[PDB]
C-alpha cells in the first residue's frame, strides 16, 4: 500500500476485510495506467 505501516495494511487500517485495500487498489491502479496511455496527451 502507499500508506501502510510497512507492507500491506496501515497501523490503523482494516485487515479484517475481504475487500482488501491492496487488491482494490490494484484494480483502480490499472484503470489509472490505462487512462494515461489510452489518452496520451498532456496539454500543449
Swiss-Prot record:
Tissue expression from the record: Isoform 2 is specifically expressed in brain, cerebellum and testis.
Phosphoserine modifications at: 14
Induction or repression: By homocysteine (HC), may mediate accelerated synthesis of free thiol-containing proteins in response to HC-induced oxidative stress. Also induced following exposure to ionizing radiation.
Comp. bias regions, Acidic residues: 5-21
Annotated family: Belongs to the EF-1-beta/EF-1-delta family.
Subunit text: EF-1 is composed of 4 subunits: alpha, beta, delta isoform 1, and gamma. Isoform 2 interacts with HSF1 and NFE2L2.
Protein's UniProt name: Elongation factor 1-delta
Underlying gene: EEF1D
Entire protein: shown range: 153 to 192 of 281
